[PDB]
Design a protein around this ligand. Sequence first.
Ligand SMILES: NC(=O)c1ccc(Oc2cccc(C(N)=O)c2)cc1
Lengths: 197, 197
Amino acid sequence: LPEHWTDMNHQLFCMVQLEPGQSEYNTIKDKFTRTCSSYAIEKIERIQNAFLWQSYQVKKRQMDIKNDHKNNERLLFHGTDADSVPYVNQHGFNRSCAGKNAVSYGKGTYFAVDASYSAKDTYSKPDSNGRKHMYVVRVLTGVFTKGRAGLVTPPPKNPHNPTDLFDSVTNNTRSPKLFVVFFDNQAYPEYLITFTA
Amino acid sequence: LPEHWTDMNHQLFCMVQLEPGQSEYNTIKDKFTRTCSSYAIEKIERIQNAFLWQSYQVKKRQMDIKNDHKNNERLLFHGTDADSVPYVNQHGFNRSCAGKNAVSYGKGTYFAVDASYSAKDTYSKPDSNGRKHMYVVRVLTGVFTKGRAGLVTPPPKNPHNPTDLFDSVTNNTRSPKLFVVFFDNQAYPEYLITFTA
Ligand SMILES: NC(=O)c1ccc(Oc2cccc(C(N)=O)c2)cc1
């Protein structure tokens, strides 16, 4: 487990409230405010989930071996409803629970490049207290191609070798604004931003 | 990587045909003929998939910690069509693939206690030549409960803590004949039996 995590005292899961003025808080606030300067952050929690971390780090090492010295990992955003937060914190992103996106590039879990996209009420639905929830997520985007609405897995790189897959798909390979992943443990929910108008 | 695997010349995937009449072949054959003695076995292959094995073993160690005992694994059967075999050998079982058979106990991957159940033509579909395909699968069934139609994950053990889930579901808790799992890397395809009626 990473050495800068708080001691969890044999526990397997903890949310750690960050302090404004720490580089760790300030980098996430800045990444968010870059496209959502109209909203205000209530708090930023670091998600310490030992099992999700272990399974994700195994998938990352495998994709680092399989791919040719790629940057396989991106830090992306995911807006969701309050009712989903306890499940995501504990169990991560389940494609079987994902909504149809208004532009579908496949049946999987969607992640945004820009906080502004995730900040829409469609994704980060305001709870009964007007709190919106957005995860900051390590995603194994790996080698990607433009997706299509029919996909239940990423497409093959080569139609004559149908099992050798792209790692993820995007809306546009030149100017990616979203990624879709189709496997468990391809995404680590690292931070939860709680925010308001 | 387990002792009984054979050398892979630094490769990460191999299908290894078992030698008839040796101890490993005999063991797997006996599990099949216990309920399928009227069938003809053409061959048995050991599936040596390093990445699938690693991801599965990580989930096993996690479930052994969580359940506080090491009785979490069962050896079960899975019949499928010839066209799904390459995908299962490389990627394992995927709840998102199944646009085919019934899902009465939930939208997960189905496994049989008896080879005779998996030997049905609706699962192990005969190809042009009457060849049928069935996997022998290590499944992390863990603590299980009765399933029902529409489940996307196992139910919670107590709805007072709705994120602490059962590991799998079954048709019948007292005398199970099938198990359903809802997460990637909860099942390792260990052997592929090629056979005919
Ligand atoms: N009662 C049901 O509706 C039912 C659903 C799926 C079933 O599928 C299975 C069960 C066990 C194994 C296999 C298989 N693919 O080998 C398929 C069987 C019964």
